[PDB]
Amino acid sequence: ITDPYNPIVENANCPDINPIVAEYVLGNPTNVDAQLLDAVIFAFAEIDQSGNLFIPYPRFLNQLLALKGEKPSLKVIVAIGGWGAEGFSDAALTPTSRYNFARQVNQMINEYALDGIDIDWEYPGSSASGITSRPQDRENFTLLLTAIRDVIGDDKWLSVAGTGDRGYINSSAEIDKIAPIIDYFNLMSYDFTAGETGPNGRKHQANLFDSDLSLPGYSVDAMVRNLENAGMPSEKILLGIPFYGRLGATITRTYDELRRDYINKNGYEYRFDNTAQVPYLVKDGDFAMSYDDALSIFLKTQYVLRNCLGGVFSWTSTYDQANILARTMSIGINDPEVLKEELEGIYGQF
């Protein structure tokens, strides 16, 4: 071994970034471990048919807030939106509608003593999920974010969830204009094969780098670079990691389901794509599942540290009820030497 993979712990080119660890939390938050995390993002507040915010199961939000009893530094954020969530094109449309949305955001912050909000509009200018869209959404989104920041002030968190493909950057968001308004861009660098079938669905959903098993232009690295090139500061990007597997458009499984029923079980076999830097499963000779494991999370957290990004997040905590992946993500940021040592217990010294 002449070329050891020596982990970065602190990047001397950006000391004083203190990258964060977050999880989106969809549903019952019983297993969330605050000790691992800097932030939790409740998913989701909805926009009802009258334009009003709605929280389905408020006790779950309250339970996340109560984690601040154990860890007062924890930030508790509410995400508004999600895939299929209607209401944003209308909310962004006019000075009146933007005021109204911002008013409701701040009322929600005050009601729950939140640390801030995440905006998850999927996506401005696109009706891919069935939601209303308009060609004015991209410019109107900037104005909406300004309306929100103006009301909530500088000392509350504002983030935007989005992607780093060229289409999002050109058609959905004005990256250079939203950058100064937001604290974080939550890069959902996964789901690359959502919407692909046949041979193109039998590809990685979240490969770090390109390989023969990846879709052209779709890699975590490409999305980060596209965002940086479009004017998002590195330190505002949070790199998203899926805690589920995908095969094309039609198959998803939680990490807990993969461990129980798929990984080296039921005819599915583990593989690691050393080029793309992600694991996958094969069955009957075919690519059969794309997911993240401890090794790929080590490599993605090293990418965060090496590239002076703002941090890392998971989608979602409840897909990993034992906090196996969450722990890896947390130590990948905060104690990478321990993660490397653990990995050398499986792969030998590297």
Catalogue all structural domains in the chain, each as residue range(s) with its CATH number.
20-347 (3.20.20.80)
Q: Quote the tokens at residue 349.
A: 């010294």
Closest CA to 30 of 44, 20, 40, 21: 40
Cα dist from 41 to 27, 140, 240, 265, 286, whole Å: 11, 24, 13, 33, 36
Angle between helices 294-306 and 220-229 (to 10 degrees): 20
**Cα 213 to Cα 217: distance, rounded to the nearest angstrom:** 12
Identify the bridge partners of residue 288 per DSSP, sorted by sequence position. none
243 near 292, Cβ under 8 Å? Answer: yes
Specify the 3-state DSSP secondary structure of 33: coil
Query: Based on the number of CB atoms within 10 Å of its own CB, is 113 exposed (0-12), middle (13-18) or buried (19 or more)?
Result: exposed
**Cα 215 to Cα 217: distance, rounded to the nearest angstrom:** 6
- Radius of gyration for the alpha carbons in the chain, expressed in angstroms and rounded: 20
Q: Is the dihedral of CA 226, 229, 232, 234 positive or negative?
A: positive
**Cα 168 to Cα 113: distance, rounded to the nearest angstrom:** 32
Q: Which long-range contacts (CB under 8 A, 24 or more apart) does 154-158 make?
A: 156/109, 156/114, 156/115, 156/116, 156/117, 157/39, 157/75, 157/77, 157/115, 157/116, 157/117, 157/118, 157/183, 157/184, 158/116, 158/117, 158/118, 158/119, 158/182, 158/183
Cα dist from 52 to 100, 136, 183, whole Å: 9, 22, 24
Q: How many CB atoms lie within 10 A of CB 39?
A: 24
Q: Quote the tokens at residue 92.
A: 């962004």
350 near 344, Cβ under 8 Å? Answer: yes
| The CA-based dihedral angle spanning residues 96, 102, 103, 109, taken in that order and rounded to the nearest 10 degrees | 170
240 near 251, Cβ under 8 Å? Answer: no
Specify the 3-state DSSP secondary structure of 338: helix
Longest dimension (CA), the chain: 64
239 near 186, Cβ under 8 Å? Answer: no
Q: Is the dihedral of CA 295, 297, 300, 305 positive or negative?
A: negative
**Cα 329 to Cα 190: distance, rounded to the nearest angstrom:** 16
Write the CB contacts of 125 (distance below 8 Å, at least 6 apart in sequence).
133, 134, 135, 137, 138, 171, 172
Q: Quote the tokens at residue 136.
A: 């004015």
**Cα 105 to Cα 151: distance, rounded to the nearest angstrom:** 9
Identify the bridge partners of residue 47 per DSSP, sorted by sequence position. 53
Specify the 3-state DSSP secondary structure of 328: helix
336 near 301, Cβ under 8 Å? Answer: yes
Q: Which long-range contacts (CB under 8 A, 24 or more apart) does 320-325 make?
A: 320/243, 320/254, 320/255, 320/256, 321/31, 321/256, 322/31, 322/256, 323/31, 323/33, 323/36, 324/255, 324/259, 324/294, 325/241, 325/243, 325/255, 325/292, 325/293, 325/294, 325/297
Q: How many residues does the chain have?
A: 350
Q: How was this structure determined?
A: X-ray
**Cα 174 to Cα 256: distance, rounded to the nearest angstrom:** 37
Query: Based on the number of CB atoms within 10 Å of its own CB, is 145 exposed (0-12), middle (13-18) or buried (19 or more)?
Result: buried
**Cα 207 to Cα 290: distance, rounded to the nearest angstrom:** 9
Q: How many CA atoms lie within 13 A of 214 on its CB side?
A: 22
**Cα 118 to Cα 265: distance, rounded to the nearest angstrom:** 38
Do β-strands 311-315 and 20-26 pair in parallel, antiparallel, or remain unpaired?
parallel
Phi, psi (deg, nearest 5) at residue 68 = -70, -15
Q: Quote the tokens at residue 327.
A: 């722990």
187 near 237, Cβ under 8 Å? Answer: yes
Specify the 3-state DSSP secondary structure of 185: strand
**Cα 320 to Cα 1: distance, rounded to the nearest angstrom:** 34
**Cα 154 to Cα 181: distance, rounded to the nearest angstrom:** 9
